Ligand binder design. Structure first.
Ligand SMILES: *[C@@H]1O[C@H](CO)[C@@H](O)[C@H](O)[C@H]1NC(C)=O
Ligand SMILES: *[C@@H]1O[C@H](CO)[C@@H](O)[C@H](O)[C@H]1NC(C)=O
Ligand SMILES: *[C@@H]1O[C@H](CO)[C@@H](O)[C@H](O)[C@H]1NC(C)=O
Lengths: 444, 444, 444
């Protein structure tokens, strides 16, 4: 299943054996709530609580109408994460909400949901969306609360109205503190049973349905709830769900740590770090590279990522793991003189970069220290090891089952003459450093 | 209204036509909740629920008193975002909460709100703050719950007490998971009707009132709720609201993308990227520049930003868009050899940086691909285009109405000799690169 | 108590007088909720609300069981913050949740909590954890709701069941929008009274107990709630609490701002910035350095940090404050030509970097401007000063009591010849710049 390989030559480790679940597109659906357009002298304590809860309903509608006085929009951005492009996440959902403001477009939705709660509607611009009516407050108020307008009430209707109205109030609270765009999509916007049935009635493959149904918590974190329109007794908000066009392709996570020399005199040390760490997944002949591995969510061996946070690299980028000096791909590195100690916890072990006077160890629960790292970059597997200490920092290692492979090799930092080594190169590569050394050497 | 101009020479696009709403200061207000200092043998099921809800009230007060055992403080920080300064956001509100601990200062507030819920109070240090009493639990408990202390109760008082007490419990929950400082300000801290009336009774211009009232959801996201003091049956917490001293000045958003050469042999390419992307707004003879455009919130054509996240640049910075080689301002760029493909979704179109073997296209809903980008930096408008693909990444473009202008020009990267081009310069400019090239040329 | 020293030579200020509270480890506890495995024809309005609330209970259990279809895991990352290592925060808690899936392990917990709500249990792998039963829904349903299965009910049982079931529903909502791992730990996962007693029954020093009890809001923000297992009528989720192995050691916060020359001709200026800003705390003969001071939480004079976000540096790093040219430690700086104006609000004052044509002032509430900064880097104390203005940005200063010391000195940027000054060095030091200048000088 999950395996790992550490490369002593480049101070890096690769965790193989994962499967992909990349979000490639969006599916926009319209969630609706039918409202009541409702306009005594009694002071009954049972009806006073009804008038109180009914005023919470009037204010919620007014608050949401005041909220839609403008076009919904989220804040847009317009190691190697700074190389990414800039997208507009809710651009697809906003385009669907723009259509619902066209005249007669809401009446098309209101009539389709007249005899059922769930319907597919083709909009005027051509988009085929799935529409869902999740709360019929119009039917409840006009059939139960209106016949009391008095003092013909009971305590059982006060409780039932507070329950039905509570969802509208909570949806309002979320939109009020999020400027009408929320993520992840809470259970008030879409309950678990509603989401599961929404996924089932969705035009996707059987493999996409089973994937989304077995990982609904991830689907929520990758969805947006966009407040849309209140018109003609209909409250509509667009839910924007992820499409996983890439499923079950190989994925692997590259971990990197600084590789420095271990000379005794302080300051005369040179360092080198592979900057291409992150998640990699095979995707359509290329490799989708996610520089900020903190953007992907891992469930057992499934990896959920968003292509918006990816670069599309040639598959030859994998050669940097075996031979960082290969002539087919220019492997990205950074150079530095900052030889500070740290550790990187991998999927099945821990990389340790111990330099200077730092105390680096690997311990077990009952027995204590079992390995003492010397100066340089080293690695230990989580088999038999429970914690790793670098300086004053205690790292817990991941206790997942898997086999690691230690690939011995000469650290490539030893191949560089420190006198002509180009320190302080942040976005560099093997060929750039060689081109810079060749200039410094010719100038001597 | 909204227009856009793409500059082929520098691979950048400017979106003009926006209006400003910059937060320049803070207005601190004091929100109060009057508490009851309350100290049978019956087992009535109606009174047992009252004793349960009353114990939730006692614990909430104790939890908030335990919360104020120290001075409230938020975590402080002390492309071009690293050039920003460091502020203390709640420093103004904390100074107001420090005054409320002075003796007799709380009694001044308690007496001002005796005959009304809303009052302006001048504190001892000279600050004139607006005080609001939003919940009188003291009056409810002492007039309704105290007369039952028994078993003279009904179910209608159990429900009404749970409703009034629920707000205090929720305010407590928020402060417990936020260390007494919350943002945005939820509807439990300040309801929509309370906030709107607070804005109305605020000493500001009529233009500031209408702006804040039409964008209350933004005012929440730019406000802080600071837990303050519990003393003498009074629960006080400071709400810190934004002041928009700059309103309706021109704003524009600068989008930049890497500009590289398109030579066939891999690695021999040089790249150049304008680093001055972000939001720009005219402000008091200068230009307020926001390097991280993700910090500003856009509502239709209004742009809400915080001057704390801005630099104050000369208005001559606008010359970099027309002539990046102008002698009046040193335009900021970065150099690199990393020619990776990406796209930047603009307000009215999309910039495409296609390099190497990447497949870059622009498509429509029904018809599919309509443009195939060649190697280099190019642009397409959202008119007729719905999606843009770079590699394995699908970008949805913004469907907002507006007119774009394509300004043809020679890409400035072609003006540089690659042999003496200074690659890997992150925080550089046009003059710095020229000064570095002149040194490499003189040394040959 | 709190003091501050500004160094005019290096444009930096140190705030001394704080005490440490560094998280060094984790303590995992198991929170349990006993569930009821429950399987009429009446339409009574009192029993219909019971069947409604009972179906919310069935769905909550089903939703949580569907949530555990995989191993819980959070998104992992694998000025000087980029030098930090990479940990797995919930690795310790996940290893405890992995043990609860072993057969018979849950039955050990179920029997220990049979006669009490609070117990210490030694697991099969050897870990001694504290187990807590916080909700016995099994006892409530089987003793009160089961005897009605009808129409023997009252309204007092509908309210009491909605109250007890509400906590399970809220715990479910949090786990649904967080993929089973939440932080901070809300009051639904662990109430304030439960947490305080959990801290009391914890195997730690008396000093750790009093510290955690007086700062429970911080303990929440540094804890994780990990959804674990639902097996044999037991709902278990692991709460992972911080261990503060370092307490009451000296801490100080280093603030830095750009130091530039003030020549009249634009562009001919060189800049220099100390990059070692952040929090420093004495820790076990070394110094724990936190490069991103926004990760530490300050309560009065106590500083709560996490060693996972720290580097372990020699105590000689403190010499950079008095003598940045000391031969014992290579002080980290960055070089630049970007002379932009900004301010840094310190604990007791404000650093001002005024360059070019920027208007930099320091004002008071009633009197207005009292100091006008000239070009260069300067400092003002919060005594008598309420606000600081740099350009169009208004900074409020911290009004905390304390004494500042202005240490006069020649700005070290004046010691460098601009013709051979190495601009655009991001991760550099004093010795690196000298080594680069010596090369440029020998080449002339
Ligand atoms: C200089 O370039 C040549 C050819 O590209 C290469 O073989 C040699 O190793 C380079 N020199 C250094 C010091 O990297
Ligand atoms: C060198 O500097 C001069 C004057 O500043 C300028 O005209 C020339 O273009 C520079 N050379 C290069 C290669 O940029
Ligand atoms: C060159 O190095 C020597 C010895 O390390 C030092 O004394 C001198 O100041 C350096 N020169 C410059 C310009 O920094």
């Amino acid at each position: 299943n999950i395996t790992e390989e550490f490369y002593q030559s480049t101070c890096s480790a690769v965790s193989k054996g994962y499967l992909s679940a990349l979000r490639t597109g969006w599916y926009t659906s319209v969630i609706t709530i039918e409202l009541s357009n409702i306009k005594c002298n009694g002071t009954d304590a049972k009806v006073k609580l009804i008038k109180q809860e009914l005023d919470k309903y009037k204010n919620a509608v007014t608050e949401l109408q005041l909220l839609m006085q403008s076009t919904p929009a989220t804040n847009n951005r317009a190691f190697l994460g700074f190389l990414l492009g800039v997208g507009s996440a809710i651009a697809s959902g906003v385009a669907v909400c723009k259509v619902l403001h066209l005249e007669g477009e809401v009446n098309k939705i209101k009539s389709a949901l007249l005899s059922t709660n769930k319907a597919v509607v083709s909009l005027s611009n051509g988009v085929s969306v799935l529409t869902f009516k999740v709360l019929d407050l119009k039917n409840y108020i006009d059939k139960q609360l209106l016949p009391i307008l008095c003092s013909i009430s009971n305590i059982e209707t006060v409780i039932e109205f507070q329950q039905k109205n509570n969802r509208l109030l909570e949806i309002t609270r979320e939109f009020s503190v999020n400027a009408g765009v929320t993520t992840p999509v809470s259970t008030y916007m879409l309950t678990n049973s509603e989401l599961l049935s929404l996924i089932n009635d969705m035009p996707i493959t059987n493999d996409q349905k089973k994937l989304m149904s077995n990982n609904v918590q991830i689907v929520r974190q990758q969805s947006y709830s966009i407040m849309c329109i209140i018109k003609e007794e209909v409250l509509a908000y667009v839910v924007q769900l992820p499409l996983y066009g890439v499923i079950d392709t190989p994925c692997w996570k590259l971990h990197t740590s600084p590789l420095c020399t271990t000379n005794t005199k302080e300051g005369s040390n040179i360092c080198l770090t592979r900057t291409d760490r992150g998640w990699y997944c095979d995707n359509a002949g290329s490799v989708s590279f996610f520089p900020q591995a903190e953007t992907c969510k891992v469930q057992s061996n499934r990896v959920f990522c968003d292509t918006m946070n990816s670069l599309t690299l040639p598959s030859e980028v994998n050669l940097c793991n075996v031979d960082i000096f290969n002539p087919k791909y220019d492997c990205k590195i950074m150079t530095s003189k900052t030889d500070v100690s740290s550790s990187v916890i991998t999927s099945l072990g821990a990389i340790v970069s111990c330099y200077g006077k730092t105390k680096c160890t690997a311990s077990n629960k009952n027995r204590g220290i079992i390995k003492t790292f010397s100066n340089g970059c080293d690695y230990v597997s989580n088999k038999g090891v429970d914690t790793v200490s670098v300086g004053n920092t205690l790292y817990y290692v991941n206790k997942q089952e898997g086999k690691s492979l230690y690939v011995k090799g000469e650290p490539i930092i030893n191949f560089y003459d420190p006198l002509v080594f180009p320190s302080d190169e942040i976005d560099a590569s093997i060929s750039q450093v060689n081109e810079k050394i060749n200039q410094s050497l010719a100038f001597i």
